[PDB]
Amino acid sequence: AITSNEIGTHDGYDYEFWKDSGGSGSMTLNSGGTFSAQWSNVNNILFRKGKKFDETQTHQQIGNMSINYGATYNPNGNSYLTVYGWTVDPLVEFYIVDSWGTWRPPGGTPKGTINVDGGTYQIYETTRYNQPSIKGTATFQQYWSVRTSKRTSGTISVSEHFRAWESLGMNMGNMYEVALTVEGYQSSGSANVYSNTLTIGGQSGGEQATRVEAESMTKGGPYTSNITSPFNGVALYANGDNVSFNHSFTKANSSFSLRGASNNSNMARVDLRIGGQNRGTFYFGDQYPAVYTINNINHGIGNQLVELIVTADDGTWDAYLDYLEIR
Amino acid sequence: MAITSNEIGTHDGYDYEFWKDSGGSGSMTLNSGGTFSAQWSNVNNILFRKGKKFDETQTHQQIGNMSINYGATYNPNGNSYLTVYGWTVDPLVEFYIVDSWGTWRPPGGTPKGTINVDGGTYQIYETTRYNQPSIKGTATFQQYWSVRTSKRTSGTISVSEHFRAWESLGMNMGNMYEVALTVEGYQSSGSANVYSNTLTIGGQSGGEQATRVEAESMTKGGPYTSNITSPFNGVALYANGDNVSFNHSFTKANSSFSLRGASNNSNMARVDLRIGGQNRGTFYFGDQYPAVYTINNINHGIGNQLVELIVTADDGTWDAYLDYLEIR
Ligand SMILES: [Ca+2]
Ligand SMILES: [Ca+2]
Ligand SMILES: [Ca+2]
Ligand SMILES: [Ca+2]
């Protein structure tokens, strides 16, 4: 188990154990986002598993964030069960607190409230003066959403809180981290986070879908042509044959579903490009219509060129395209 | 749909894929971590998997030691495999480490060798596929196999052990494209529940042979670096550019770095890690008491490289005291 300050990645999740002097702590990393923790007579201790970012993107550019979790939570003293993280420029430490120990944080007068995920959160902004931070000993703002009543399982719509904060004038910088966290202050305790899933993107923005017919897009290359069998669509025959269109992306992540087919029993490949960058390859194994889906594409909001292009043709197959759905 | 058609993606940190050709049906449900359930009915070929896709730039030695710990409820009705699965490119190779199967134990042919590992025995085969579907379209390519001599549906698969066994038998491997725990069906129906599936790249401890290098024994650099005796035998880094460095011979591709140090006062000290001239992370020392800060899972590649510990964020409010660095 982890008993001193450590940063790493475990089963795809970025984890961290942090304490200052005094007392002891133990963190045990389990599968997915899960972990158990125990602490005894600490000054400050933090256990978390989530994602660290490279400090280059806002939370809008990263996309919709949501955490689904469940915890056995037994603090003995001052403690939080909370989503936690940081932004830079401005340097901000933030909290979405769902439960706590003996003291409901953070004191002071709320700047607002948000009703979300079946509860009510009061929103606070505080200041830390010459305190430990990701940038050393520093003075920085703290943003809080604190539930009006305790709960230790459910879904936390992280992006909703970020937008709530920002509308109340609490500017956020580029993201540094988002993680489900157990914090202790001047206390002891144990906790078992048995469920902890951080999801970026694909939430119930996935039940609307935009279908763009291949035959309605702009044709390019030497031979691209319309077809009517095995569906209304286009055929891409040689390298450089392509179909493309400008799309106005409202959100930052999407899945792309191409319905198509090869002309014969050889496997056809169609490349996906956004803004001129390859983002993956659609595969059609045979002559029967099939839908191939490339999920979890981060591309950023705004109007961008979408291309579907054949680059690996060698005269043994053509590609037939019916439509592309963007979710 | 709860994946019922060909799809590639990332879920909870794992690269997942659903692939079938024409005929029959299949359904894959993605659960936490590497886990998923799968069911198929009257298919020609179907594959469900969760693991890691790679960028085709590294050999498996450069990626590092790979090991999968898994458990599955496995109920095939026909020809099927419960297997580690993946690809290399240049050469294009499809590979299998099969722990269980359905009605037919693959792959036929005569074994090229054996390996005893993870408490079982595996026979090793090499076969050829002619104009079959692959990650490079319809192609002709080799297949590498390790197949257990008897079925098992939970345990640990020391993937890198099989890779080295294969290569020593002249089954040369290309740059890695994918490694994943997989359920495959051929001309069959079935269900499976993979309730545990952990892919570990860089995990240790069959020889956890931690190397401690004392800060005072390393090479000093910068304007003020000096020895100290309190709070330990070590060195102090005072200004930007002050550093200590040493050459380390890295046997494996991934390491953990545990730096014992302290600030001189109650302000937080920061020390940067450089390997081979590249910034690889930052150690934090929150106060004046000796503490160990560990940066885990650093991929750095095999070979002799300069390890440097350097202060770059000094502003006159703290110094950094270093006792030793352990590489594990
Ligand atoms: Ca063609
Ligand atoms: Ca169409
Ligand atoms: Ca200094
Ligand atoms: Ca020393």
Side-chain angles (χ1 to χ4, degrees), chain A residues 236-239 241 263 310 313-319:
Chain A
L236 317 175
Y237 299 96
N239 292 327
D241 279 348
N263 67 320
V310 166
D313 166 75
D314 60 351
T316 58
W317 51 264
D318 311 315

Side-chain angles (χ1 to χ4, degrees), chain A residues 73-122:
Chain A
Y73 182 46
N74 296 111
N76 177 24
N78 189 356
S79 159
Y80 318 135
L81 173 72
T82 179
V83 179
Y84 172 91
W86 293 80
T87 72
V88 300
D89 302 295
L91 186 68
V92 176
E93 186 187 38
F94 63 80
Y95 292 81
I96 303 158
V97 183
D98 262 12
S99 181
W100 54 89
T102 60
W103 178 65
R104 179 177 180 270
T109 45
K111 300 181 63 101
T113 62
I114 170 179
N115 310 285
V116 65
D117 306 307
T120 310
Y121 293 84
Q122 296 176 274

Side-chain angles (χ1 to χ4, degrees), chain A residues 5-9 11 13 15 18 21 133-135 137 197 266-267 269 283 286 288 291-293 295-296, chain B residues 6-10 12 14 16 19 22 133 135-136 138 198 267-268 270 284 287 289 292 294 296-297:
Chain A
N5 292 345
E6 187 171 315
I7 198 191
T9 304
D11 223 29
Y13 275 77
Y15 70 94
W18 172 265
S21 296
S133 83
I134 57 178
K135 305 292 205 217
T137 299
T197 297
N266 291 323
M267 187 173 260
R269 283 178 289 162
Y283 289 79
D286 60 32
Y288 297 108
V291 180
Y292 191 98
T293 288
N295 199 17
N296 314 103
Chain B
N6 293 343
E7 185 171 311
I8 201 186
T10 307
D12 225 28
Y14 277 77
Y16 69 88
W19 169 265
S22 269
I135 57 179
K136 304 296 197 220
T138 306
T198 297
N267 291 326
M268 179 168 264
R270 282 177 290 162
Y284 290 83
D287 62 32
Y289 296 107
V292 183
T294 294
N296 195 25
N297 338 100

